[PDB]
Design a protein around this ligand. Structure first.
Ligand SMILES: CCCCOc1cnc(N)nc1OCC
Ligand SMILES: [Mg+2]
Ligand SMILES: [Zn+2]
Length: 313
């Protein structure tokens, strides 16, 4: 019970910052997550025995893919930690329990292919789940690991509280489907502008939670330029793999997934920062002002991509 996780001085300080990078030491990632849970939620939220077992079954069910891997899981969970920590009084007990677990679990058993390629390949999962294919699968994988004997980290919640947290985790994971974000953020932009936004309205909380999930999921664009740049290599490694497989289906992929069209990548990132990232963190900073550091980091990285195109790097 009195067993606290303590990090080295540089991590203990840097971890509280939005732009924290969890480092190349995989065996430190569990303790970093448990440390974030203990300070976000409490030393009591979970039986340390069951959480540790949970964490390690979750790790085992991520694959060895260039981007959608165990590192991505802990990285997305860390972004949520900083949002939660900078917004102490806005989220309930069950939300702070749910959302970190939601983030660690959000890409379980990812193969490195989009919902598009699953449908064109005619993968079994595309017949099981017609929309948000991989995200319904990710949520299914979370339930199954929660159901392994000794793994139920919520065991100590009432029937209602348990369904409340599963519900938060399900919507949280489904919201990571980027196809759903555009309408989520538009709706949120309207509600905030017309003043109709109300955090006592569950429908409204759901939408704000969805946007937080998108913000955390995309958080590689809110790191320092060297992390953002080296992570982009992992992202495009998956995209080029998927384009290769599209070509094997006899379909010419979109230039973003064509490894012949690598020159178009810098311009590819401008479109993405302007179309997806900046809007996402703009509305987030409007609804939760203390998350402004993410928009600032995103704007700087937009500048760094501009400077790449202009041949300055
Ligand atoms: C397919 C997953 C959706 C996340 O897509 C991205 C995330 N972060 C960056 N820097 N670029 C992305 O695509 C840009 C072409
Ligand atoms: Mg995903
Ligand atoms: Zn993800």
């Amino acid at each position: 019970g009195l067993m606290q996780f303590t990090l080295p001085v540089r991590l203990c300080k840097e971890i509280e910052l939005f732009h924290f990078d969890i480092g190349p030491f995989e065996n430190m990632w569990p303790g970093i997550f448990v440390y974030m849970v203990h300070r976000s939620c409490g030393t009591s939220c979970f039986e340390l025995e069951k959480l540790c077992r949970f964490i390690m079954s979750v790790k085992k069910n991520y694959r060895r893919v260039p981007y959608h891997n165990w590192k991505h899981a802990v990285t997305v969970a860390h972004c949520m930690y900083a949002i939660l920590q900078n917004n102490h009084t806005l989220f309930t007990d069950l939300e702070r329990k749910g959302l970190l677990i939601a983030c660690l679990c959000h890409d379980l058993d990812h193969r490195g292919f989009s919902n598009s390629y699953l449908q064109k390949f005619d993968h079994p999962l595309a017949a099981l789940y017609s929309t948000s294919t991989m995200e319904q699968h990710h949520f299914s994988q979370t339930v199954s690991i929660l159901q392994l004997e000794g793994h139920n980290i919520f065991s100590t919640l009432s029937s209602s509280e348990y369904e409340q947290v599963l519900e938060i985790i399900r919507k949280a994971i489904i919201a990571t489907d980027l196809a759903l974000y555009f309408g989520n953020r538009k709706q949120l932009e309207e509600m905030y502008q017309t003043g109709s936004l109300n955090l006592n309205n569950q429908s409204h909380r759901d939408r704000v939670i969805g946007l937080m999930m998108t913000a955390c999921d995309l958080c590689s664009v809110t790191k320092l330029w060297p992390v953002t740049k080296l992570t982009a290599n992992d992202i495009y490694a998956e995209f080029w793999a998927e384009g290769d497989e599209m070509k094997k289906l006899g379909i010419q992929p979109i230039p973003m997934m064509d490894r012949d069209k690598k020159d178009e990548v810098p311009q590819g990132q401008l479109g993405f920062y302007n179309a997806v990232a900046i809007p996402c963190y703009t509305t987030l900073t409007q609804i939760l002002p203390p998350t402004e550091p993410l928009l600032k980091a995103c704007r700087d990285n937009l500048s760094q991509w501009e400077k790449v195109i202009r041949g300055e790097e």
